[PDB]
Structure 1
């Protein structure tokens, strides 16, 4: 009675470099016979001033997606190779493969989310 086209055992918490608890995945490479992308992230309202990770890298390009119910309802700082960037929702930022990076939530309302879309099947 589990439906093979629906996954409900989410998020999938994976150990990731630079983190101090597992990172929450919603798409993993082993889903549905093999996916070409992975997707991690979560809701930001309890993360204001609380970084999930030190600077870390992936071997594939990644895209950050920042959304919130109200325009401007979430703001994150993203460090990229030591250069500070800032995103106000809605926003998309490219994180080049091998770039040392991390994010810090500066502002978030209920329903603010950041997701990282990893353009490949490897971490």
Structure 2
């Protein structure tokens, strides 16, 4: 009864440079015969003031997507090659390939999520 169209074995925690625990992936390049993007992220109600990574890079462009049940329920700081940016949910920020970056949760409610959509199949 495993259905080839359904993956329940999630998240997939992958070792990623800059991170101190594995990064929780929901889409990986090896799923469904090969995917053109990867996606990782999580709920940040417990991550306010706690960054998941140091400044890091990836060989592909990465889009951050920040959502929360209430408008403006979540806020993150993103460092982009040393320059502070802030996002208020809902928001999307592009992180160019090669850019040294990371994010910090400054505010979150139950149900706030940040995802990173990696526009390629390599890390």
Q: TM-score, normalised by structure 1?
A: 1.00
Partner SS, residue 78 of structure 1: strand
Unaligned runs of 5+ in 2: none
1:71 CA drift (Å): 0.3
The separation in 2 between residues aligned to 1:10 and 1:112, in whole angstroms, is: 18
1:91 CA drift (Å): 0.2
Unaligned runs of 5+ in 1: none
1:102 CA drift (Å): 0.2
**Number of positions where the alignment pairs a residue of Structure 1 with one of Structure 2:** 123
Q: Which runs of 4+ in 1 moved over 6 A?
A: none
1:93 CA drift (Å): 0.2
The separation in 1 between residues aligned to 2:90 and 2:19, in whole angstroms, is: 25
Q: Give me the CA root mean square deviation.
A: 0.3
The separation in 2 between residues aligned to 1:95 and 1:56, in whole angstroms, is: 11
Partner SS, residue 32 of structure 2: helix
Partner SS, residue 116 of structure 1: strand
1:72 CA drift (Å): 0.4
Q: What whole-Å deviation, never above 9, does each CA across 1:80-102 have from its counterpart, x for those lacking one?
A: 00000000000000000000000
Q: What whole-Å deviation, never above 9, does each CA across 1:12-31 have from its counterpart, x for those lacking one?
A: 00000001000000000000
